[model samples]
Target: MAEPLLVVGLGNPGPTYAKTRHNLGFMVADVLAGRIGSAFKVHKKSGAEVVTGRLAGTTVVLAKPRISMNESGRQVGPLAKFYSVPPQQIVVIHDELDIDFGRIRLKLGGGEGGHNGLRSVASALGTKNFHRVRIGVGRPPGRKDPAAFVLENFTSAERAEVPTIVEQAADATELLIAQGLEPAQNTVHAW
Candidate 1:
């Protein structure tokens, strides 16, 4: 492996936020870790739990920030510098409100779309060129605040689909790393 690709799963820390829609990023990270047969260990300097392994034969550093979602950049920026992973090689897996549930969108270099976590990341990196594996959670129902919607646990019906969603997102992340953005996007979007 040349330079390891940095894959970040954005979410709030702790049990309180574990199952929330906002933590879908974390959930996908967990699945990838499992596939890699690695366990997360604290990376003291970066304030994150990280697992280093090969995914689809590509060296990857999978991480979940220990800070709140809004402060995600604090962990990500430093991690990128430590690993010498450039913006284009960094992949951020996160929840997206604009897309429907069960859908996964892959893109590189775009605006944050009001996502605080993404905003903080772009600000820290000083670029929007990083890849984003956006897992859709859909919009809030009937005037519900988007903030509240993201923090809440999925409904029982949606919960049943959570496993599939995370698995698909994880697969997409691997495809993106092993192949490239467009191939991964086509495969994931077609599902």
Candidate 2:
């Protein structure tokens, strides 16, 4: 049988960051896991909690790195290699600031756009050609710092729409996995 697609949600580990904008990747991982009736277990070889399942008729290995955002490549690289998945077969779901709230965008790799998780993963994998499910968290209010803003939980207004956003992201992720990049991009960007 062919190796499963590698799906990763990038975020810092632990409870404090659980609901923060930076942890959107983890949230989507949870959503995907829930759909598959699977739970994340710490993978000794990969050093991340992972769940393997089929989404949209495609087998996938979903992961939530158990490390800081900047060091995600430490485990992500090994996970991809262990599963025999190439960079192009990996889809990383993560938060995006440039997009407005409740929006999502899909992209093949380019710049990391100052996202430490993307930078770390690219550095570890030696390439930036993977797919991304960029879930929009929007910019911070006023003059708040980007770093600090991401670490903060979503505002009440944002939280009200978070569930729907996560669901859409998960849907978009499955589309990417099952239908391929350009089609997924077309569908997601249309919304």
Candidate 3:
């Protein structure tokens, strides 16, 4: 079998960042990895936990770098380059604050929208042309800090719908990996 497309998920390390909205990238990668019967193993050299698997009927290497969000490009670009997968083959999944919770956005390339992880990835990769699957977390409530709001988990009111949202996004991710953006967008935009 040949090496497959590279799937890079962005997030910080530690149990503290686990399950927070900021770690949604890791969460999607984990769920996708699990679907293919794999678990993450720490890649010490890159300071990341890597999950290798097949998704959307293709071989894929899913990674969540252990570095903080600001330095994600360091791991992502180097790893993809090391594997000989030019920037276009890298698919990134991350959280987006601009949209409402449970929503998903598709884009091939653009600016970072103030996301440190994205900024790092673009800078390290030396391009802004890779694909992105953005999972929405919505903006902060009145007077709340957007930063703190994202770090906090879904409220009781949002909890019931959260898993469904994640599931939808996971489906979207798999479709994107196998079918590319236009078809994937058609599949995910309805959610």
Candidate 4:
């Protein structure tokens, strides 16, 4: 409503992907919205649940693309077009197997880290120019399928602290938009 932005969080829809690594993006989007007391509204145009609000005084459109991870581009492309946000302005949050648990990294323009949601987004945008916040989920142990491992819920103890990361991720995003890369980097990592 206020200008426009497309902050698409990548994840699959329904209970199956709820606690999965795929939904990390969605969770972080919620954390960002919750920080400001604004709720996401399902928009018919974007085929996503979008929350419109200000982050660091910048109008933002936060979206959780409703398709499965592989199909995310279909929704994201339209959302970006509708909002008139260039790919660079879109900030994506998702889990990263490359980093260990309890670690968070912010990147602007890079590869997708073997993440389908990222892949879809890159494909849709025709570039990997967007910003991304990758939260560490660690690699799967033993013979567990990487896909299956992501779907499992966190250990009971880990559940308590996950919100803290999500909240920090939200703050980092605002800092990034408001203050640019260095301030965001300084603000996002407290480990």
Instruction: For residues 2-114, write the lDDT of model 1, one tens digit per residue.
Output: 79999999889999999999999999999999999989999988878999988988889999999998888988999999999999999999999999999999999977775
Judged by lDDT, which candidate is best? 1
Model 2, backbone clash pairs (residues 3+ apart or across chains), number: 0
Residues 1-191, candidate 3: write the lDDT tens digits.
46567888777788888878888888777777788787888776665678776678887878888788888888887778666787777889888988778889888998666477888899988899998889988888899877677678767877777678767778888888788899889767863
lDDT of each: 0.92, 0.90, 0.81, 0.80
- lDDT of candidate 4 over 1-191, digit per residue (tens): 35555676777789877776658788888787786578877789867788887767878888887778888888888888887888778888888888888788889897777687888889998999988988888898888877777778887877878888778777777787888777787766765
The RMSD (Cα, Å) of candidate 2 is 1.1
What is the TM-score of each predicted model, taking all chains together? 0.96, 0.97, 0.91, 0.91
Q: lDDT, candidate 4, residue 121?
A: 85
lDDT (Cα) of model 2:
0.90
Give residue 20's error in model 3 in angstroms.
Answer: 1.5
The clash number for model 3 is 0
TM-score, cand. 4: 0.91
Q: Please give, for residues 81-161, the per-residue lDDT of candidate 2 as tens digits.
A: 998999899999999988888889999988776588999999999999998999988888999988889999998988998
Clash pairs, model 2 backbone: none
